[PDB]
């Protein structure tokens, strides 16, 4: 036997050290640990998109909860907040909902007033004032 | 378990040997000894392949021709079967034909 392999145990350990916390014979036998570690790494890679999606769905749930505490629906809050040119994303809106409820009541009052201004503008086509909390700031 | 528990004894090798120091001396003899000898006449090996590279089929054919009149019986039969098998391999099987 010219040059047969000596450091095989270190390759076995290189696969097995990611499988110490498994259940069954997968934490010991190499033939089973390889397939389960491969599936574990593929799940870890595919989980990033699901993490971002699930976090934004959690923020949508918390913002819906706080706005429905204020008698506002979620689409009314998000739409009429973006129509006042305040660009707060869902993360800081949920964090304001949990930790700063006075600022969230101020934001819900702003969204409801811009909603009412839009409704009176729809009945009147303007004429005169196009509201007050309308009139977007123009950048050039 | 495959690995050995204790590391092996230290393998100490003499780099200034008798054989290692004079390696390559009287190589390059034909060029600057006005061509009386070839450097392939410095080779010490089997009588058939002294200055000859060859294949596996070609090595076996040359060994059968140059020496096979004085080989042992079982070795001669094994060489015959090896030449038969290698002809069948190289001239009928493989890719790239």
């Amino acid at each position: 036997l010219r040059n047969r392999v000596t450091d095989r145990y270190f390759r076995i350990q290189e696969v097995l050290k990611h499988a110490r916390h498994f259940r069954g014979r997968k934490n010991r036998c190499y033939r089973l640990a390889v397939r389960t570690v491969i599936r574990a790494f593929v799940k870890c890679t595919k989980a990033r998109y699901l993490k971002k999606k699930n976090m934004r769905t959690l923020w949508i749930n918390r913002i819906t909860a706080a706005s429905q505490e204020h008698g506002l629906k979620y689409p009314a809050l998000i739409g009429n907040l973006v129509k006042c040119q305040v660009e707060l994303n869902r993360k800081v809106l949920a964090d304001l909902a949990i930790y700063e409820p006075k600022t969230f009541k101020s934001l819900a009052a702003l969204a409801s007033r811009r909603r009412h201004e839009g409704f009176a503008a729809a009945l009147g086509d303007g004429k005169e004032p196009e509201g007050i909390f309308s009139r977007v700031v123009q950048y050039h | 378990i495959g690995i050995r528990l204790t590391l092996p004894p230290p393998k100490v090798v003499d780099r200034w040997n008798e054989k290692r120091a004079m390696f390559g001396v009287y190589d390059n003899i034909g060029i600057l000894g006005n061509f009386e000898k070839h450097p392939k006449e410095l080779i010490r090996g089997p009588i058939w392949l002294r200055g000859w590279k060859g294949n596996e089929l070609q090595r076996c054919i040359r060994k059968r021709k140059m020496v096979g009149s004085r080989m042992f019986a079982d070795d001669l039969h094994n060489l015959n079967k090896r030449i038969r098998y290698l002809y069948k391999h190289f001239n009928r099987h493989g890719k790239f034909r």
């Binding site: 450091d7 145990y9 270190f10 | 690995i3 050995r4 590391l7 092996p8």
Partner: peptide, 26 residues
Amino acid sequence: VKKGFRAAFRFQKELERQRLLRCPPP
């Protein structure tokens, strides 16, 4: 035996690592 030195030395360093993790010094 399998001939060679580097895998035996690497397993030696792992043995010292495991044995030092079992009985840590003061």
